[PDB]
mmCIF file of C-alpha atoms and ligand atoms in Angstrom:
data_model
loop_
_atom_site.group_PDB
_atom_site.id
_atom_site.type_symbol
_atom_site.label_atom_id
_atom_site.label_comp_id
_atom_site.label_asym_id
_atom_site.label_seq_id
_atom_site.Cartn_x
_atom_site.Cartn_y
_atom_site.Cartn_z
ATOM 1 C CA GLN A 1087 0.000 0.000 0.000
ATOM 2 C CA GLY A 1088 1.166 3.533 -0.720
ATOM 3 C CA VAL A 1089 0.328 7.227 -0.385
ATOM 4 C CA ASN A 1090 1.037 9.673 -3.208
ATOM 5 C CA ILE A 1091 0.687 13.430 -2.984
ATOM 6 C CA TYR A 1092 0.178 15.808 -5.889
ATOM 7 C CA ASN A 1093 -0.411 19.530 -6.184
ATOM 8 C CA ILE A 1094 -2.710 20.542 -9.012
ATOM 9 C CA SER A 1095 -2.864 24.108 -10.260
ATOM 10 C CA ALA A 1096 -6.241 25.010 -11.795
ATOM 11 C CA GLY A 1097 -6.328 24.182 -15.490
ATOM 12 C CA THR A 1098 -3.645 21.482 -15.311
ATOM 13 C CA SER A 1099 -3.459 17.739 -14.685
ATOM 14 C CA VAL A 1100 -0.943 15.386 -13.060
ATOM 15 C CA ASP A 1101 0.316 11.942 -14.051
ATOM 16 C CA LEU A 1102 0.150 9.436 -11.206
ATOM 17 C CA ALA A 1103 3.185 7.514 -9.981
ATOM 18 C CA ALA A 1104 0.687 4.864 -8.911
ATOM 19 C CA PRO A 1105 -2.494 4.273 -10.940
ATOM 20 C CA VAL A 1106 -5.840 4.176 -9.161
ATOM 21 C CA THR A 1107 -7.740 0.918 -9.615
ATOM 22 C CA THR A 1108 -10.654 -0.950 -8.019
ATOM 23 C CA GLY A 1109 -10.517 -0.599 -4.243
ATOM 24 C CA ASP A 1110 -8.406 2.566 -4.393
ATOM 25 C CA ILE A 1111 -9.142 6.117 -3.208
ATOM 26 C CA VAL A 1112 -8.475 9.667 -4.388
ATOM 27 C CA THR A 1113 -9.138 12.797 -2.333
ATOM 28 C CA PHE A 1114 -8.842 16.342 -3.648
ATOM 29 C CA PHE A 1115 -8.200 18.988 -0.976
ATOM 30 C CA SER A 1116 -9.072 22.657 -1.442
ATOM 31 C CA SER A 1117 -7.641 25.297 0.901
ATOM 32 C CA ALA A 1118 -10.570 27.603 0.104
ATOM 33 C CA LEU A 1119 -14.286 27.534 -0.626
ATOM 34 C CA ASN A 1120 -16.173 30.153 -2.620
ATOM 35 C CA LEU A 1121 -19.807 29.213 -3.159
ATOM 36 C CA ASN A 1122 -20.352 32.824 -4.181
ATOM 37 C CA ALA A 1123 -17.995 32.703 -7.182
ATOM 38 C CA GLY A 1124 -19.003 34.149 -10.542
ATOM 39 C CA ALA A 1125 -21.220 32.139 -12.891
ATOM 40 C CA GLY A 1126 -19.664 29.219 -14.734
ATOM 41 C CA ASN A 1127 -19.482 28.712 -18.490
ATOM 42 C CA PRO A 1128 -21.030 26.350 -17.552
ATOM 43 C CA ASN A 1129 -18.520 24.952 -15.058
ATOM 44 C CA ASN A 1130 -17.048 26.811 -12.076
ATOM 45 C CA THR A 1131 -14.868 23.860 -11.201
ATOM 46 C CA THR A 1132 -14.383 20.353 -12.537
ATOM 47 C CA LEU A 1133 -12.283 17.545 -11.104
ATOM 48 C CA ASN A 1134 -11.381 14.608 -13.366
ATOM 49 C CA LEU A 1135 -10.034 11.055 -13.312
ATOM 50 C CA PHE A 1136 -8.358 10.142 -16.624
ATOM 51 C CA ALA A 1137 -7.358 6.867 -18.256
ATOM 52 C CA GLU A 1138 -3.905 6.828 -19.902
ATOM 53 C CA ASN A 1139 -5.569 6.861 -23.333
ATOM 54 C CA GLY A 1140 -7.109 10.239 -22.530
ATOM 55 C CA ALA A 1141 -10.589 8.987 -21.630
ATOM 56 C CA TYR A 1142 -12.556 10.898 -18.970
ATOM 57 C CA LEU A 1143 -13.384 8.059 -16.576
ATOM 58 C CA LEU A 1144 -15.078 10.472 -14.191
ATOM 59 C CA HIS A 1145 -15.863 14.147 -14.732
ATOM 60 C CA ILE A 1146 -17.189 16.109 -11.726
ATOM 61 C CA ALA A 1147 -18.577 19.509 -12.654
ATOM 62 C CA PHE A 1148 -19.665 22.121 -10.117
ATOM 63 C CA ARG A 1149 -22.069 24.685 -11.542
ATOM 64 C CA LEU A 1150 -23.193 27.428 -9.163
ATOM 65 C CA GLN A 1151 -25.413 29.224 -11.667
ATOM 66 C CA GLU A 1152 -27.282 25.981 -12.354
ATOM 67 C CA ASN A 1153 -26.876 24.950 -8.703
ATOM 68 C CA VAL A 1154 -25.886 21.386 -9.538
ATOM 69 C CA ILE A 1155 -22.996 18.915 -9.711
ATOM 70 C CA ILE A 1156 -22.704 16.947 -12.957
ATOM 71 C CA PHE A 1157 -21.051 13.551 -13.338
ATOM 72 C CA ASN A 1158 -20.146 12.209 -16.789
ATOM 73 C CA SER A 1159 -17.542 10.240 -18.752
ATOM 74 C CA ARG A 1160 -16.141 10.624 -22.263
ATOM 75 C CA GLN A 1161 -13.980 8.535 -24.608
ATOM 76 C CA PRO A 1162 -10.568 10.054 -25.563
ATOM 77 C CA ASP A 1163 -11.820 11.907 -28.631
ATOM 78 C CA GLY A 1164 -15.503 11.110 -28.296
ATOM 79 C CA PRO A 1165 -18.736 12.843 -27.243
ATOM 80 C CA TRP A 1166 -19.728 13.373 -23.618
ATOM 81 C CA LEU A 1167 -21.834 10.456 -22.440
ATOM 82 C CA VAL A 1168 -24.877 10.282 -20.159
ATOM 83 C CA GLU A 1169 -24.864 13.064 -17.563
ATOM 84 C CA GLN A 1170 -25.807 12.241 -13.972
ATOM 85 C CA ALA A 1171 -26.821 15.208 -11.831
ATOM 86 C CA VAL A 1172 -27.021 15.988 -8.133
ATOM 87 C CA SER A 1173 -28.843 19.202 -7.281
ATOM 88 C CA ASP A 1174 -27.900 21.813 -4.674
ATOM 89 C CA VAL A 1175 -24.172 22.590 -4.612
ATOM 90 C CA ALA A 1176 -23.912 24.447 -1.295
ATOM 91 C CA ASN A 1177 -25.799 21.719 0.587
ATOM 92 C CA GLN A 1178 -23.091 19.173 -0.221
ATOM 93 C CA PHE A 1179 -20.521 21.473 1.397
ATOM 94 C CA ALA A 1180 -22.560 22.549 4.447
ATOM 95 C CA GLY A 1181 -20.763 22.034 7.744
ATOM 96 C CA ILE A 1182 -17.302 23.184 6.704
ATOM 97 C CA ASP A 1183 -16.292 26.659 5.549
ATOM 98 C CA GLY A 1184 -13.112 28.031 4.025
ATOM 99 C CA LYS A 1185 -12.046 24.577 2.865
ATOM 100 C CA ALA A 1186 -13.308 21.346 1.380
ATOM 101 C CA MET A 1187 -12.363 17.879 0.241
ATOM 102 C CA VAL A 1188 -13.774 15.673 -2.499
ATOM 103 C CA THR A 1189 -13.239 11.938 -2.343
ATOM 104 C CA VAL A 1190 -13.760 9.338 -5.054
ATOM 105 C CA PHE A 1191 -13.759 5.636 -4.229
ATOM 106 C CA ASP A 1192 -13.236 3.293 -7.186
ATOM 107 C CA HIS A 1193 -15.607 0.414 -6.508
ATOM 108 C CA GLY A 1194 -14.983 -1.482 -9.736
ATOM 109 C CA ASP A 1195 -18.208 -0.764 -11.606
ATOM 110 C CA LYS A 1196 -19.060 2.482 -9.803
ATOM 111 C CA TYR A 1197 -17.389 5.645 -8.538
ATOM 112 C CA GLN A 1198 -18.559 6.795 -5.119
ATOM 113 C CA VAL A 1199 -18.163 10.538 -4.679
ATOM 114 C CA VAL A 1200 -18.009 12.097 -1.221
ATOM 115 C CA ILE A 1201 -17.885 15.818 -0.476
ATOM 116 C CA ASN A 1202 -16.369 16.253 2.988
ATOM 117 C CA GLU A 1203 -18.361 13.600 4.894
ATOM 118 C CA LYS A 1204 -21.406 13.549 2.575
ATOM 119 C CA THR A 1205 -21.860 10.834 -0.050
ATOM 120 C CA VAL A 1206 -23.110 12.672 -3.114
ATOM 121 C CA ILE A 1207 -23.449 9.954 -5.753
ATOM 122 C CA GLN A 1208 -22.905 6.263 -6.538
ATOM 123 C CA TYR A 1209 -21.864 6.843 -10.163
ATOM 124 C CA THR A 1210 -22.280 3.763 -12.349
ATOM 125 C CA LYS A 1211 -19.277 3.814 -14.679
ATOM 126 C CA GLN A 1212 -19.822 4.488 -18.369
ATOM 127 C CA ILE A 1213 -16.139 3.816 -18.973
ATOM 128 C CA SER A 1214 -13.890 1.497 -16.944
ATOM 129 C CA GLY A 1215 -10.119 1.305 -16.599
ATOM 130 C CA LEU A 1216 -7.204 2.522 -14.500
ATOM 131 C CA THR A 1217 -6.995 6.202 -13.572
ATOM 132 C CA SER A 1218 -3.533 7.376 -14.672
ATOM 133 C CA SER A 1219 -3.882 11.133 -14.268
ATOM 134 C CA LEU A 1220 -6.077 13.654 -12.432
ATOM 135 C CA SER A 1221 -6.971 17.223 -13.246
ATOM 136 C CA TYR A 1222 -8.582 20.289 -11.696
ATOM 137 C CA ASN A 1223 -9.940 22.837 -14.158
ATOM 138 C CA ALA A 1224 -11.265 26.343 -13.459
ATOM 139 C CA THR A 1225 -10.641 30.055 -13.936
ATOM 140 C CA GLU A 1226 -8.775 32.048 -11.306
ATOM 141 C CA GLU A 1227 -11.957 34.078 -11.150
ATOM 142 C CA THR A 1228 -14.899 31.687 -10.870
ATOM 143 C CA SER A 1229 -13.505 28.572 -9.191
ATOM 144 C CA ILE A 1230 -15.159 27.363 -5.993
ATOM 145 C CA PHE A 1231 -11.783 25.986 -4.829
ATOM 146 C CA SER A 1232 -8.285 27.379 -4.194
ATOM 147 C CA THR A 1233 -5.847 28.058 -7.044
ATOM 148 C CA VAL A 1234 -3.953 24.906 -6.155
ATOM 149 C CA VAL A 1235 -5.775 21.746 -5.155
ATOM 150 C CA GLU A 1236 -3.886 19.017 -3.294
ATOM 151 C CA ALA A 1237 -4.574 15.463 -4.455
ATOM 152 C CA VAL A 1238 -3.777 12.428 -2.315
ATOM 153 C CA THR A 1239 -4.185 8.879 -3.591
ATOM 154 C CA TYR A 1240 -4.332 5.674 -1.549
ATOM 155 C CA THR A 1241 -3.398 2.799 -3.815
ATOM 156 C CA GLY A 1242 -2.863 -0.953 -3.712
ATOM 157 C CA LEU A 1243 -5.608 -1.310 -1.132
ATOM 158 C CA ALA A 1244 -7.351 -4.332 -2.686
ATOM 159 C CA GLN B 1148 -17.629 3.254 2.592
ATOM 160 C CA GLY B 1149 -17.371 6.594 4.364
ATOM 161 C CA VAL B 1150 -15.147 9.600 5.053
ATOM 162 C CA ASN B 1151 -15.016 11.208 8.496
ATOM 163 C CA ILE B 1152 -13.222 14.425 9.339
ATOM 164 C CA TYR B 1153 -12.003 15.477 12.768
ATOM 165 C CA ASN B 1154 -10.034 18.423 14.083
ATOM 166 C CA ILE B 1155 -7.694 17.605 16.941
ATOM 167 C CA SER B 1156 -6.242 20.310 19.148
ATOM 168 C CA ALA B 1157 -2.878 19.348 20.674
ATOM 169 C CA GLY B 1158 -3.338 17.530 23.964
ATOM 170 C CA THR B 1159 -6.843 16.258 23.178
ATOM 171 C CA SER B 1160 -8.431 13.233 21.517
ATOM 172 C CA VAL B 1161 -11.562 12.615 19.437
ATOM 173 C CA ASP B 1162 -14.116 9.803 19.472
ATOM 174 C CA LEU B 1163 -14.768 8.360 16.023
ATOM 175 C CA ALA B 1164 -18.232 8.207 14.480
ATOM 176 C CA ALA B 1165 -16.901 5.223 12.548
ATOM 177 C CA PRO B 1166 -14.326 2.889 14.130
ATOM 178 C CA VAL B 1167 -11.181 2.014 12.203
ATOM 179 C CA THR B 1168 -10.726 -1.707 11.590
ATOM 180 C CA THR B 1169 -8.677 -4.016 9.354
ATOM 181 C CA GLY B 1170 -8.442 -2.572 5.853
ATOM 182 C CA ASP B 1171 -9.163 0.976 7.030
ATOM 183 C CA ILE B 1172 -7.036 4.140 6.871
ATOM 184 C CA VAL B 1173 -6.341 7.169 9.057
ATOM 185 C CA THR B 1174 -4.395 10.242 7.952
ATOM 186 C CA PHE B 1175 -3.368 13.084 10.243
ATOM 187 C CA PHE B 1176 -2.772 16.417 8.486
ATOM 188 C CA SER B 1177 -0.573 19.158 9.931
ATOM 189 C CA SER B 1178 -0.724 22.698 8.533
ATOM 190 C CA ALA B 1179 2.817 23.351 9.783
ATOM 191 C CA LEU B 1180 6.164 21.637 10.241
ATOM 192 C CA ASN B 1181 8.799 22.626 12.787
ATOM 193 C CA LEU B 1182 11.743 20.237 12.816
ATOM 194 C CA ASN B 1183 13.586 22.895 14.797
ATOM 195 C CA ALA B 1184 11.194 22.844 17.771
ATOM 196 C CA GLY B 1185 12.482 22.754 21.339
ATOM 197 C CA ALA B 1186 13.601 19.459 22.877
ATOM 198 C CA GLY B 1187 10.927 16.978 23.893
ATOM 199 C CA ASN B 1188 10.339 15.527 27.350
ATOM 200 C CA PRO B 1189 10.901 13.127 25.684
ATOM 201 C CA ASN B 1190 8.198 13.593 23.047
ATOM 202 C CA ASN B 1191 7.743 16.648 20.817
ATOM 203 C CA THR B 1192 4.645 15.161 19.263
ATOM 204 C CA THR B 1193 2.757 11.895 19.564
ATOM 205 C CA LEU B 1194 -0.179 10.663 17.513
ATOM 206 C CA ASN B 1195 -2.284 7.792 18.886
ATOM 207 C CA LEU B 1196 -4.899 5.219 17.895
ATOM 208 C CA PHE B 1197 -6.992 4.121 20.900
ATOM 209 C CA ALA B 1198 -9.280 1.173 21.581
ATOM 210 C CA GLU B 1199 -12.568 2.008 23.348
ATOM 211 C CA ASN B 1200 -11.229 0.406 26.539
ATOM 212 C CA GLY B 1201 -8.453 2.997 26.649
ATOM 213 C CA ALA B 1202 -5.686 0.806 25.223
ATOM 214 C CA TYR B 1203 -2.977 2.479 23.111
ATOM 215 C CA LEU B 1204 -3.176 0.358 19.958
ATOM 216 C CA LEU B 1205 -0.539 2.497 18.269
ATOM 217 C CA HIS B 1206 1.577 5.256 19.794
ATOM 218 C CA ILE B 1207 3.737 7.321 17.404
ATOM 219 C CA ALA B 1208 6.279 9.493 19.184
ATOM 220 C CA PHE B 1209 8.444 12.086 17.443
ATOM 221 C CA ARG B 1210 11.567 12.989 19.398
ATOM 222 C CA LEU B 1211 13.808 15.637 17.844
ATOM 223 C CA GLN B 1212 16.397 15.630 20.621
ATOM 224 C CA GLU B 1213 16.816 11.867 20.237
ATOM 225 C CA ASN B 1214 16.259 12.168 16.475
ATOM 226 C CA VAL B 1215 13.915 9.193 16.309
ATOM 227 C CA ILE B 1216 10.288 8.102 15.937
ATOM 228 C CA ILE B 1217 9.061 5.561 18.494
ATOM 229 C CA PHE B 1218 6.200 3.119 17.982
ATOM 230 C CA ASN B 1219 4.642 1.305 20.951
ATOM 231 C CA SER B 1220 1.366 0.029 22.417
ATOM 232 C CA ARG B 1221 0.018 -0.098 25.968
ATOM 233 C CA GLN B 1222 -2.920 -1.760 27.739
ATOM 234 C CA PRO B 1223 -5.524 0.621 29.291
ATOM 235 C CA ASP B 1224 -3.835 0.878 32.681
ATOM 236 C CA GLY B 1225 -0.739 -1.155 31.914
ATOM 237 C CA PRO B 1226 2.970 -0.591 31.212
ATOM 238 C CA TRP B 1227 4.304 0.528 27.839
ATOM 239 C CA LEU B 1228 5.178 -2.507 25.750
ATOM 240 C CA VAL B 1229 8.043 -3.186 23.339
ATOM 241 C CA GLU B 1230 9.266 0.000 21.656
ATOM 242 C CA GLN B 1231 10.027 -0.057 17.930
ATOM 243 C CA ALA B 1232 12.240 2.762 16.674
ATOM 244 C CA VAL B 1233 12.946 4.428 13.350
ATOM 245 C CA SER B 1234 15.920 6.779 13.350
ATOM 246 C CA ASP B 1235 16.221 10.180 11.661
ATOM 247 C CA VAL B 1236 13.099 12.325 12.047
ATOM 248 C CA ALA B 1237 13.778 15.004 9.423
ATOM 249 C CA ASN B 1238 14.565 12.422 6.729
ATOM 250 C CA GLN B 1239 11.039 11.013 6.933
ATOM 251 C CA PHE B 1240 9.664 14.489 6.197
ATOM 252 C CA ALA B 1241 12.138 15.514 3.469
ATOM 253 C CA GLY B 1242 10.481 16.707 0.276
ATOM 254 C CA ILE B 1243 7.684 18.760 1.806
ATOM 255 C CA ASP B 1244 8.036 21.865 3.966
ATOM 256 C CA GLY B 1245 5.554 23.863 6.006
ATOM 257 C CA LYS B 1246 3.163 20.920 6.188
ATOM 258 C CA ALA B 1247 2.981 17.174 6.606
ATOM 259 C CA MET B 1248 0.698 14.178 6.757
ATOM 260 C CA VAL B 1249 0.975 10.912 8.659
ATOM 261 C CA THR B 1250 -0.958 7.895 7.471
ATOM 262 C CA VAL B 1251 -1.649 4.638 9.287
ATOM 263 C CA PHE B 1252 -3.039 1.633 7.436
ATOM 264 C CA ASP B 1253 -4.605 -1.064 9.621
ATOM 265 C CA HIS B 1254 -3.502 -4.312 8.007
ATOM 266 C CA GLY B 1255 -5.005 -6.656 10.587
ATOM 267 C CA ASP B 1256 -1.871 -7.816 12.389
ATOM 268 C CA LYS B 1257 0.281 -4.787 11.545
ATOM 269 C CA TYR B 1258 0.047 -1.005 11.342
ATOM 270 C CA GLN B 1259 1.772 0.528 8.333
ATOM 271 C CA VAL B 1260 2.888 4.085 9.010
ATOM 272 C CA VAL B 1261 3.557 6.503 6.160
ATOM 273 C CA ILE B 1262 4.932 10.023 6.523
ATOM 274 C CA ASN B 1263 3.913 11.986 3.426
ATOM 275 C CA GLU B 1264 4.828 9.437 0.724
ATOM 276 C CA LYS B 1265 7.471 7.543 2.746
ATOM 277 C CA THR B 1266 6.678 4.237 4.450
ATOM 278 C CA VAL B 1267 8.359 4.482 7.833
ATOM 279 C CA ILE B 1268 7.459 1.214 9.555
ATOM 280 C CA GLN B 1269 5.478 -2.033 9.280
ATOM 281 C CA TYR B 1270 4.531 -2.160 12.974
ATOM 282 C CA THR B 1271 3.587 -5.646 14.156
ATOM 283 C CA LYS B 1272 0.707 -5.104 16.576
ATOM 284 C CA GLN B 1273 1.251 -5.784 20.266
ATOM 285 C CA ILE B 1274 -2.433 -5.114 20.870
ATOM 286 C CA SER B 1275 -5.281 -5.690 18.398
ATOM 287 C CA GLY B 1276 -8.803 -4.295 18.237
ATOM 288 C CA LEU B 1277 -10.886 -1.495 16.752
ATOM 289 C CA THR B 1278 -9.593 2.075 16.932
ATOM 290 C CA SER B 1279 -12.386 4.132 18.527
ATOM 291 C CA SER B 1280 -10.582 7.402 19.198
ATOM 292 C CA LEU B 1281 -7.476 9.284 18.035
ATOM 293 C CA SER B 1282 -5.317 11.829 19.784
ATOM 294 C CA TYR B 1283 -2.552 14.334 19.086
ATOM 295 C CA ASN B 1284 -0.460 15.330 22.090
ATOM 296 C CA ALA B 1285 2.162 18.087 22.348
ATOM 297 C CA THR B 1286 3.001 21.444 23.907
ATOM 298 C CA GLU B 1287 2.216 24.667 22.074
ATOM 299 C CA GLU B 1288 5.939 25.254 22.318
ATOM 300 C CA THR B 1289 7.733 22.098 21.191
ATOM 301 C CA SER B 1290 5.341 20.393 18.774
ATOM 302 C CA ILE B 1291 6.582 19.610 15.271
ATOM 303 C CA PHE B 1292 3.012 20.049 13.964
ATOM 304 C CA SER B 1293 0.374 22.809 13.964
ATOM 305 C CA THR B 1294 -1.773 23.533 17.029
ATOM 306 C CA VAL B 1295 -4.687 21.764 15.387
ATOM 307 C CA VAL B 1296 -4.179 18.575 13.417
ATOM 308 C CA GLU B 1297 -6.866 17.453 10.967
ATOM 309 C CA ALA B 1298 -7.682 13.741 11.016
ATOM 310 C CA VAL B 1299 -9.467 12.006 8.146
ATOM 311 C CA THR B 1300 -10.545 8.374 8.324
ATOM 312 C CA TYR B 1301 -11.533 6.096 5.444
ATOM 313 C CA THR B 1302 -13.644 3.291 6.841
ATOM 314 C CA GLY B 1303 -15.587 0.242 5.698
ATOM 315 C CA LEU B 1304 -13.048 -0.396 2.965
ATOM 316 C CA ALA B 1305 -12.711 -4.165 3.481
HETATM 317 C C1 LIG C 1590 -22.839 25.997 -22.026
HETATM 318 C C2 LIG C 1590 -23.497 24.896 -21.493
HETATM 319 O O1 LIG C 1590 -24.431 25.063 -20.519
HETATM 320 N N1 LIG C 1590 -23.210 23.672 -21.927
HETATM 321 C C3 LIG C 1590 -23.878 22.482 -21.379
HETATM 322 C C4 LIG C 1590 -25.170 22.189 -22.147
HETATM 323 O O2 LIG C 1590 -24.876 21.885 -23.519
HETATM 324 C C5 LIG C 1590 -24.757 23.004 -24.283
HETATM 325 C C6 LIG C 1590 -23.999 22.952 -25.448
HETATM 326 C C7 LIG C 1590 -23.939 24.057 -26.290
HETATM 327 C C8 LIG C 1590 -24.633 25.217 -25.964
HETATM 328 N N2 LIG C 1590 -24.580 26.270 -26.773
HETATM 329 O O3 LIG C 1590 -23.824 26.201 -27.974
HETATM 330 O O4 LIG C 1590 -25.259 27.470 -26.426
HETATM 331 C C9 LIG C 1590 -25.383 25.273 -24.794
HETATM 332 C C10 LIG C 1590 -25.445 24.166 -23.956
HETATM 333 O O5 LIG C 1590 -25.802 21.041 -21.561
HETATM 334 C C11 LIG C 1590 -24.977 19.876 -21.720
HETATM 335 C C12 LIG C 1590 -25.721 18.647 -21.194
HETATM 336 O O6 LIG C 1590 -26.917 18.459 -21.954
HETATM 337 C C13 LIG C 1590 -23.672 20.053 -20.941
HETATM 338 O O7 LIG C 1590 -23.971 20.200 -19.551
HETATM 339 C C14 LIG C 1590 -22.926 21.288 -21.452
HETATM 340 O O8 LIG C 1590 -21.753 21.580 -20.680
HETATM 341 C C15 LIG C 1590 -20.745 20.571 -20.845
HETATM 342 O O9 LIG C 1590 -20.990 19.501 -19.917
HETATM 343 C C16 LIG C 1590 -19.978 18.486 -20.000
HETATM 344 C C17 LIG C 1590 -20.333 17.308 -19.089
HETATM 345 O O10 LIG C 1590 -21.548 16.696 -19.534
HETATM 346 C C18 LIG C 1590 -18.619 19.068 -19.604
HETATM 347 O O11 LIG C 1590 -18.689 19.582 -18.271
HETATM 348 C C19 LIG C 1590 -18.266 20.209 -20.557
HETATM 349 O O12 LIG C 1590 -17.051 20.831 -20.130
HETATM 350 C C20 LIG C 1590 -19.400 21.235 -20.538
HETATM 351 O O13 LIG C 1590 -19.144 22.271 -21.489
HETATM 352 C C1 LIG C 1591 12.162 10.832 29.753
HETATM 353 C C2 LIG C 1591 12.371 9.764 28.888
HETATM 354 O O1 LIG C 1591 13.353 9.827 27.950
HETATM 355 N N1 LIG C 1591 11.606 8.679 28.969
HETATM 356 C C3 LIG C 1591 11.791 7.535 28.064
HETATM 357 C C4 LIG C 1591 12.819 6.557 28.638
HETATM 358 O O2 LIG C 1591 12.349 6.011 29.880
HETATM 359 C C5 LIG C 1591 12.629 6.818 30.939
HETATM 360 C C6 LIG C 1591 11.843 6.732 32.083
HETATM 361 C C7 LIG C 1591 12.166 7.482 33.208
HETATM 362 C C8 LIG C 1591 13.275 8.322 33.188
HETATM 363 N N2 LIG C 1591 13.586 9.033 34.267
HETATM 364 O O3 LIG C 1591 12.793 8.922 35.441
HETATM 365 O O4 LIG C 1591 14.698 9.919 34.239
HETATM 366 C C9 LIG C 1591 14.056 8.416 32.041
HETATM 367 C C10 LIG C 1591 13.733 7.662 30.918
HETATM 368 O O5 LIG C 1591 12.989 5.474 27.711
HETATM 369 C C11 LIG C 1591 11.769 4.728 27.578
HETATM 370 C C12 LIG C 1591 12.006 3.514 26.678
HETATM 371 O O6 LIG C 1591 12.989 2.668 27.279
HETATM 372 C C13 LIG C 1591 10.684 5.614 26.961
HETATM 373 O O7 LIG C 1591 11.098 6.025 25.657
HETATM 374 C C14 LIG C 1591 10.447 6.839 27.848
HETATM 375 O O8 LIG C 1591 9.527 7.771 27.263
HETATM 376 C C15 LIG C 1591 8.199 7.232 27.192
HETATM 377 O O9 LIG C 1591 8.064 6.466 25.983
HETATM 378 C C16 LIG C 1591 6.734 5.946 25.831
HETATM 379 C C17 LIG C 1591 6.657 5.038 24.601
HETATM 380 O O10 LIG C 1591 7.510 3.903 24.779
HETATM 381 C C18 LIG C 1591 5.734 7.097 25.700
HETATM 382 O O11 LIG C 1591 6.077 7.902 24.569
HETATM 383 C C19 LIG C 1591 5.796 7.960 26.960
HETATM 384 O O12 LIG C 1591 4.946 9.099 26.802
HETATM 385 C C20 LIG C 1591 7.239 8.424 27.169
HETATM 386 O O13 LIG C 1591 7.349 9.158 28.390
#
């Protein structure tokens, strides 16, 4: 078992030293929380788990203006697949201010997403595979998280 | 599976909403790092996993003056057991400044301790059982970590 730490500036991605597979965990840590950020176009912030081939295994989109969190997947150079949506952004974060954490458990055929201590969705995968890189995209203006998001992975758990 | 967050002021402990058992994980996060803190008496900082009966399942002691990290266990109202020691404190933290994280994996008959990304010890348990509370002890003067340490547990993984 191992712990890997990464620092992700908004708009960039990182390649993992250890891939995330079934039974593994990834937690994104934000040193800030701005639920009053400007409107998204349409996203304020997105967090993503990528396959080495470029596929979007899991796409987490926070949209304040639409007050919802979208979950989707997408083949390397393909169209976005079936969107799953959880309504009420601020409710998922309630209980903790000025910071936040987003955790994704890889349960084989589903991705469990947890905001702080709250389970937000049991996302049935539309695309399977090993997560080889992670990303955090947003503008320095309308992101709900800090400029740099810390990612910690817990691998080789199974 | 669930995520639980706790904030631990130095010298206090917290009771877990979800106990940590075999296959589970606990990570202590410090917002500071002072490897130049005053001498310990003999500990500068200790992090602990407790059983509900008060037993010290795992005791992690950081001693700058002795430049070593001690690992031990202790029955509720019993003597300290066999000490395990890893030498060179600062080396375990090398690579990251101003902050740190300490992770403990409960592997059934052993506790794996990881400082940041470095595995420090594969502690063979001297006392088994469920971890029901965690603590972070130190003086506001000679602690190597921040005044408040954030603890995150990942339970129900097995
Ligand atoms: C701008 C916007 O709200 N895009 C949404 C919208 O789809 C469109 C596409 C084009 C236009 N337009 O030319 O005016 C408007 C809306 O709804 C889609 C779902 O039906 C998407 O939500 C789309 O945003 C895209 O969502 C995907 C994830 O599904 C991903 O987050 C993309 O980055 C995002 O643009
Ligand atoms: C002060 C000190 O260095 N204590 C150490 C030492 O044991 C003693 C006990 C008493 C005296 N004394 O009356 O002068 C000096 C030293 O070595 C022990 C191991 O052989 C311990 O390391 C002890 O510290 C205690 O360690 C345990 C864990 O084993 C725990 O961290 C206690 O909080 C700590 O005091």
